[PDB]
Ligand binder design. Structure first.
Ligand SMILES: [Cl-]
Ligand SMILES: [Cl-]
Ligand SMILES: [Cl-]
Ligand SMILES: [K+]
Ligand SMILES: [Mg+2]
Ligand SMILES: [Mg+2]
Ligand SMILES: [Mg+2]
Ligand SMILES: [Mg+2]
Ligand SMILES: [Mg+2]
Ligand SMILES: [Mg+2]
Ligand SMILES: [Mg+2]
Ligand SMILES: [Mg+2]
Ligand SMILES: [Mg+2]
Ligand SMILES: [Mg+2]
Ligand SMILES: [Mg+2]
Ligand SMILES: [Mg+2]
Ligand SMILES: [Mg+2]
Ligand SMILES: [Mg+2]
Ligand SMILES: [Mg+2]
Ligand SMILES: [Mg+2]
Ligand SMILES: [Mg+2]
Ligand SMILES: [Mg+2]
Ligand code: NA
Ligand code: NA
Ligand code: NA
Ligand code: NA
Ligand code: NA
Ligand code: NA
Ligand code: NA
Ligand code: NA
Ligand code: NA
Ligand code: NA
Ligand code: NA
Ligand SMILES: [Sr+2]
Ligand SMILES: [Sr+2]
Ligand SMILES: [Sr+2]
Ligand SMILES: [Sr+2]
Ligand SMILES: [Sr+2]
Ligand SMILES: [Sr+2]
Ligand SMILES: [Sr+2]
Ligand SMILES: [Sr+2]
Ligand SMILES: [Sr+2]
Ligand SMILES: [Sr+2]
Lengths: 237, 119, 194, 46
RNA sequence: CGCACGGAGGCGAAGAACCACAGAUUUCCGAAUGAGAAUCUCUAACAAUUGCUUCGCGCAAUGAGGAACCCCGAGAACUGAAACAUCUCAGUAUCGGGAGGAACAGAAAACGCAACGUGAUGUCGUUAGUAACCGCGAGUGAACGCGAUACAGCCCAAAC
RNA sequence: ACUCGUACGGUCACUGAAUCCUGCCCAGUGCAGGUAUCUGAACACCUCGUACAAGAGGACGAAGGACCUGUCAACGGCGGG
RNA sequence: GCUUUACUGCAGGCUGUCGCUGAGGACUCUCACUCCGGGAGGAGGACACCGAUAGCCGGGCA
């Protein structure tokens, strides 16, 4: 047959790429040597095309102007601190070790110094639960208990733009505008609606996947479609 | 370094090189790793010098153990060019051997003894 | 008596034992951080180089080349083939890694000609070989009685035509009798059945 | 379109070639430009 | 005073034309090399990779071409087997790299008419569709030797 | 490539606005998890064999399978008497 | 051309084993190797990656 869509993606052609030339910046944490003597002022609030959420422009003491992964409640004029001795306040960044237990955090680093990997989307937040000298236990937005190095930096508060998912797109055209801002081919044609040559579910008079949808983890690309290694399906049970 | 098992003080090395210089003007010395090797093998060597900046180390690796099983005493020199100059060469020398000293027999003998104490 | 060289030789007979083992363990850390072709001032295996034709003269160059370890890196068939011509994983190339190394070196030094080469070890993912190259245009070599032969026109790009010792061995030209029916005088003239 | 200096030289040459065989050549050879081109009917290069 | 049988004019005994050999001139693009460009442009140039090095592009090398032949790599299918998969077509077509006027090979860790014998290597004739291979099917297929051609043997590494 | 992206994400699929709803079946097939015991290759190991080798057998046993379990908005099924 | 529990194979995934690979049937360490860090340094670690092979799945492909 012919390579299915999921395989066309891999090639990374224009159709499947994200509009990077239109993107603003990666909201990574500042790199401070030590001393914490790095504070700045929120100079402006901007819209981030890549995340459909507001982001804050900060002007630091040492003359650095950088965009920041902004939590809810950050406003122009406000002073932000980044470092070990940072004040425990919303919008401030400091290692998990310096953060008190039971405090909502966002833009959490996976490995100290990476700039932040977890809890970055609209309205989400990680919850700092347990402390230690060797490991900080954080509950991620998915509900997973994650063990992290206490030296991993994070921002206090939840990510701005919460509730975005609460309003329906209502019309195709609205979805359209959003997809243009992402690395995604849209709209979506069902496998069962294509010819047998184009997808494992294509062909046959009436539309129907002529086989069970739960596919093995070991299935090769081109065959791995439908319900990937499902532990179960449906709503019952 | 893989062949070096002890550090020789800069002062001992100075004396040793001076001893080597008067050994060539008076007695006889061997210049070059091959010639030095045969001396230790024929037993004609009284004191062998080995540079420490020899790359690759293969060239000299064998000297230390070969000298040990032949009773022949050895000493290290930090630089290859110095050993070569002391032997009276425009070029460097990875290893050298004072085959029968000359008007420095007492000095050479002391140097050997100073090394023994130094492991 | 034994030459000093015989000791370098004897050490290299068992690269995994003695001082050589520690030397290699140290060196490879540096080699892995080096490029594909690194010119070196002195051969790592002096005895082997001199034995192969090396001389501490002008126009003699030694370079260490690293090549990925293992079999062929082959692309699977687009069009239809019989099961016999479908395989992809176990198929290996007909040229050995040492030969690939010699060619990469000669390409880096276009004006020079490959004289010979030898192995200097390998790790789990790559192999290293040191190639001896000669400058056929330098008078110190045109006047050398033991090397001036490499200056001849027919010796140009000798490595690319399989004229190196590794080339000749790989072409099955070692044996003068039984087994060399399809190798001598050339693989091509014997219908490429060697 | 916009022609470069080089293109212009080429077009100019093509125009010059597009002439009739001189009359004196007819007499000399005792009896037709096989390359006569028309702007509309034919097509030049580039 | 070309092909080229016109007109006008001119050159040649100051030996022209014509021919051989040698030399001069030889625009731009082109490996194309100062940077760039559909044959042009812009502001001193071995661009790039190398060797030597007076460490300065100072001295040099490479690049690209050529009818096929040649050497080293990559390597089909149609086809045959009256299907077809091993096998066959075939190491063929085609691709990548490279040399020369020819390439390649070549002075035995050979041969093994087993010998008290031959004596580097190609190639030609033969050995022979033999030995060997093979859904032991279809098919594939040497060698030693012999008769010829031409003949030529040497250099390192190490010991000292 | 996705990705200047990080679960309010994005990947893979099915259905196809709203409204009222969406029953029964895990035997087969698929996916997933577990598994005392059974089965389960090669290397190394052990026995026989060979002055060696081919080879025969043994012990151990991964994933997998047997076996158990979960699962139908998973493939699908919901008859005759 | 297409399909599949047709025949025969090939990718690919999973899994064991050998090499890379080091020191003191369960373990500790650091020194290769890997990852984070501008750096110092931190995390991990003889595993993982990679080469080789073996068993299972394997119309994704011929
Ligand atoms: Cl969306
Ligand atoms: Cl060459
Ligand atoms: Cl004979
Ligand atoms: K065929
Ligand atoms: Mg960012
Ligand atoms: Mg778009
Ligand atoms: Mg759709
Ligand atoms: Mg249709
Ligand atoms: Mg299909
Ligand atoms: Mg349907
Ligand atoms: Mg006109
Ligand atoms: Mg130019
Ligand atoms: Mg047929
Ligand atoms: Mg065959
Ligand atoms: Mg020939
Ligand atoms: Mg038949
Ligand atoms: Mg054949
Ligand atoms: Mg024979
Ligand atoms: Mg429908
Ligand atoms: Mg519809
Ligand atoms: Mg990295
Ligand atoms: Mg098919
Ligand atoms: Na070259
Ligand atoms: Na026209
Ligand atoms: Na000319
Ligand atoms: Na040049
Ligand atoms: Na220069
Ligand atoms: Na037929
Ligand atoms: Na047929
Ligand atoms: Na067959
Ligand atoms: Na006879
Ligand atoms: Na069922
Ligand atoms: Na068709
Ligand atoms: Sr980032
Ligand atoms: Sr970064
Ligand atoms: Sr269908
Ligand atoms: Sr239900
Ligand atoms: Sr020197
Ligand atoms: Sr060339
Ligand atoms: Sr027209
Ligand atoms: Sr002869
Ligand atoms: Sr509805
Ligand atoms: Sr079931």
């Amino acid at each position: 047959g012919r390579r299915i869509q999921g395989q066309r993606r891999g090639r990374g052609t224009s159709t499947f790429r994200a509009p990077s030339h239109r993107y603003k910046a990666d909201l990574e944490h500042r790199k401070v040597e030590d001393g914490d003597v790095i504070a700045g002022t929120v100079v402006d609030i901007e819209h981030d095309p890549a995340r459909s959420a507001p982001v804050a422009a900060v002007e630091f003491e040492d003359g650095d102007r950088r965009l920041i992964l902004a939590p809810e409640g950050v406003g122009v004029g406000d002073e932000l601190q980044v470092g070990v001795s940072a004040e425990i306040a919303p919008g401030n960044t400091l290692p998990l070790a310096e953060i008190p237990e039971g405090v909502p955090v966002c833009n959490v680093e996976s490995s100290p110094g990476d700039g932040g990997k977890f809890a970055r989307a609209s309205g989400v937040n990680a919850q700092l639960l347990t402390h230690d000298r060797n490991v900080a236990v954080v509950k991620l937005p998915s509900g997973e208990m994650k063990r992290l190095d206490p030296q991993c930096r994070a921002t206090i508060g939840v990510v701005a733009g919460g509730g975005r998912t609460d309003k329906p797109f209502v019309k195709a055209g609205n979805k359209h505008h959003k997809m243009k801002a992402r690395g995604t081919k849209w709209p979506n044609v069902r496998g069962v609606a294509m010819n047998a040559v184009d997808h494992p579910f294509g062909g046959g008079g009436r539309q129907h996947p002529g086989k069970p949808k739960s596919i093995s983890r070991n299935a090769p690309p081109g065959r791995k479609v439908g319900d990937i290694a499902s532990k179960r399906t449906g709503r019952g049970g | 370094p893989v062949y070096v098992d002890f550090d020789v003080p800069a002062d001992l090395e100075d004396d040793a090189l001076e001893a080597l210089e008067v050994a060539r003007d008076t007695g006889a010395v061997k210049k070059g790793t091959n010639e030095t090797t045969k001396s230790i093998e024929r037993g004609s060597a009284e004191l062998v010098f080995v540079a420490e900046d020899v790359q690759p180390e293969e060239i000299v690796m064998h000297i230390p153990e070969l000298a040990d099983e032949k009773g022949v005493p050895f000493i290290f020199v930090e630089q290859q060019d110095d050993l070569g100059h002391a032997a009276g060469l425009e070029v460097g020398s990875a290893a050298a051997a004072v085959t029968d000293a000359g008007e420095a027999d007492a000095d050479v003998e002391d140097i050997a003894d100073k090394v023994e104490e130094l492991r | 008596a034994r030459s000093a060289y015989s000791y370098i030789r004897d050490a290299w007979k068992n690269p995994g034992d003695g001082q050589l083992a520690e030397l290699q363990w140290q060196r490879q850390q540096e080699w892995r951080n080096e490029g594909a072709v690194e010119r070196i001032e002195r051969p790592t295996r002096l005895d082997k180089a001199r034995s192969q034709g090396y001389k501490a003269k002008q126009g003699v160059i030694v370079a260490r080349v690293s090549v990925r370890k293992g079999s062929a890196r082959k692309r699977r068939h687009k069009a239809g083939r019989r099961s016999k011509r479908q395989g992809v994983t176990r198929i290996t190339r007909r040229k050995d890694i040492q030969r690939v190394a010699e060619e990469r070196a000669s390409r880096t030094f276009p004006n020079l000609r490959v004289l010979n080469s030898y192995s200097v070890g390998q790790d789990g993912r790559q192999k290293w070989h040191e190639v001896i190259l000669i400058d056929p245009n330098h008078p110190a070599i045109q006047n050398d009685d033991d090397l001036s032969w490499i200056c001849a026109d027919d010796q140009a790009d000798r490595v690319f035509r399989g004229l190196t010792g590794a080339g000749r061995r790989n072409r099955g030209l070692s044996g003068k009798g039984k087994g060399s029916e399809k190798t001598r005088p050339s693989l091509r003239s014997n219908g490429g059945k060697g | 379109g916009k022609k470069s200096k080089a293109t212009k030289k080429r077009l100019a040459k093509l125009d010059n070639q597009n002439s009739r065989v001189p009359a004196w050549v007819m007499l000399k050879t005792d009896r037709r430009n096989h390359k006569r081109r028309h702007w509309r009917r034919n097509d030049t290069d580039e």
